[PDB]
Amino acid sequence: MITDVQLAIFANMLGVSLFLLVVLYHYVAVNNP
Amino acid sequence: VRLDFSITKDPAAEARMKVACITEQVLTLVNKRIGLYRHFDETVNRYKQSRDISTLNSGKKSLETEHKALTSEIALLQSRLKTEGSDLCDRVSEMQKLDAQVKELVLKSAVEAERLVAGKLKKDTYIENEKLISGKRQ
Amino acid sequence: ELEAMSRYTSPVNPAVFPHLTVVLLAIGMFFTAWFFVYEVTSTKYTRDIYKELLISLVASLFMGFGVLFLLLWVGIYV
Amino acid sequence: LRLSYEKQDTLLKLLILSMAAVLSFSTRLFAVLRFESVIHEFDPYFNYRTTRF
């Protein structure tokens, strides 16, 4: 199936990307016209 | 989506929707007109124009400006919000700038002197006025 | 008899199921996102039905083949 | 770039929400990758034996 290590790495990358994207969303929100 | 299921109808809410839709039609038309005018000026005024294709492009640009003016008059008269003053001002300024740039290009491509720096400055001023119009058009 | 017949080679080599599923699913998901985005950002005056229908059809098609191949890859072999 | 503010905003909100959902559903999935999918501890063995009946 999928090694535990693989799943953990995927979880880490997804979480970090999601948090950076949330920050980017806050920047876009403030920048509204 | 096709089911209204609304008991009370309010005029201001529908007015906002229609005004936004009109402002979308207008913005799309302005973008298309700038793209067309710029493409025609770049593909018909390279080294030889003969004042034939340039005249057709000027006629097409005048027709597009007339359609945009008709849409602006429709949004001014029919709708409740003004949405006309800034729109009409930007439309008049863009039409005048496009006519002046087309005249300068047709004069530089059909004369003894080849204007290169003057044409670049005219294109930069046109792009600056277009950027100001896009900043004012929200 | 049995000699006349020959080994039943599968139409799709199984080793290609994962990659084939991925691309199809990706494309299908992207189309679905587009449809939902279009649904959210559209007023009543500007809702082209032809566009909606076409995007829906393509999305569903890809999503269907995607899910099927994904299921197959999981080893259920429906 | 060319995309309007509305479309961009909603596509970001939707992207982030979907990612978050997948993240949550795929981080409480450790006890299954290691050992096969079997219910564990003292309580889930009654709820299971009841939902089955």
DSSP per position, A1-33: ---HHHHHHHHHHHHHHHHHHHHHHHHHHHT--
Q: What angle do CA B3, B7, B13 make, to 5 degrees?
A: 80
Beta-carbon separation of D26 and A18 below 8 A: no
Which residues fall within 8 angstroms of residue D22, CB to CB, at 6 or more apart?
A: A14
DSSP letter assigned to residue C74: T
Beta-carbon separation of C46 and B21 below 8 A: yes
Residues of chain C found within 8 Å of residue D15, distances taken between Cβ atoms: 33
Q: Which residue of D has its CA nearest to A14?
A: D23
Mapped onto helix, strand or coil, the DSSP state of residue D39 is: coil
Contact between B106 and B54 under an 8 Å Cβ cutoff? The reply is: yes
Residue among A1, A15, A28 whose CB faces D12 most closely: A28
Cα-Cα-Cα-Cα dihedral sign, residues D24, D25, D26, D27: positive
Contact between C51 and B5 under an 8 Å Cβ cutoff? The reply is: no
Task: Classify residue D8 by burial, with Cβ atoms within 10 Å: 0-12, 13-18, 19+.
Answer: middle
Residue located via tokens 């199921």:
C17
Question: From residue C57, how far is each of C28, C39, C40 by CA, in Å?
Answer: 10, 15, 18
Q: Which amino acid is at C77?
A: Y
d(CA C78, CA C7): 20
d(CA B108, CA C49): 48
| Residue B62 C-beta-side C-alpha neighbours within 13 Å | 9
DSSP letter assigned to residue B94: H
Contact between B135 and B106 under an 8 Å Cβ cutoff? The reply is: no
Beta-carbon separation of A11 and D23 below 8 A: yes
Contact between B127 and B101 under an 8 Å Cβ cutoff? The reply is: no
| Beta carbons within 10 angstroms of residue B17's beta carbon | 14
**Interchain contact B17–C (C-beta under 8 A):** yes
Beta-carbon separation of C40 and D4 below 8 A: no
User: With b meaning 16 or more CB within 10 Å and e meaning fewer, what string describes B94-109?
Assistant: bbebbeebbebbbebb
d(CA C17, CA C66): 10
DSSP letter assigned to residue B59: H
DSSP letter assigned to residue B96: H
**DSSP one-letter string for C24-47:** HHHHHHHHHHHHHHHHHS--SSS-
Which residues fall within 8 angstroms of residue C73, CB to CB, at 6 or more apart?
A: C17, C18, C21
Contact between B15 and B60 under an 8 Å Cβ cutoff? The reply is: no
> What tokens appear for B14 in the block?
């529908």
d(CA C53, CA C30): 16
d(CA B29, CA B103): 22
Q: What angle do CA A23, A29, A30 make, to 5 degrees?
A: 95
Angle of helix B85-108 relative to helix B11-44, nearest 10 degrees? 10
Q: How far is D34 from chain A (nearest CA, A)?
A: 7
Residues in chain C: 78
**Interchain contact B24–C (C-beta under 8 A):** yes
DSSP letter assigned to residue B50: T
- The closest alpha carbon to D4, from C31, C41, B130, belongs to C41
Mapped onto helix, strand or coil, the DSSP state of residue B47 is: coil
d(CA B51, CA B57): 10
Helix, strand, coil share of chain C (percent; to 5): 65, 0, 35
Residues in chain B: 138
Q: Which of residues 37-66 of C touch D (CB under 8 A)?
A: 37, 40-41
- The closest alpha carbon to D12, from A24, C74, C63, belongs to A24
Residues of chain C found within 8 Å of residue B1, distances taken between Cβ atoms: 39, 47
Q: Is D43 annotated as a binding residue?
A: yes
Contact between A18 and D20 under an 8 Å Cβ cutoff? The reply is: yes
Residues in chain D: 53
Task: Classify residue A14 by burial, with Cβ atoms within 10 Å: 0-12, 13-18, 19+.
Answer: middle
Question: From residue B40, how far is each of B8, C7, C14 by CA, in Å?
Answer: 50, 64, 53
Contact between B57 and B40 under an 8 Å Cβ cutoff? The reply is: yes
d(CA B65, CA B58): 10
Beta-carbon separation of D14 and C41 below 8 A: no
> What tokens appear for D45 in the block?
């063995």
d(CA A31, CA B57): 38
Rg (CA), chain C: 19
Beta-carbon separation of D10 and C33 below 8 A: no
Helix, strand, coil share of chain A (percent; to 5): 80, 0, 20
Q: Which amino acid is at B31?
A: N
**Interchain contact B74–C (C-beta under 8 A):** no
Residue located via tokens 């080893």:
C75
Distance of CA B1 to the CA centre of its chain: 33
> What tokens appear for D52 in the block?
């089955």
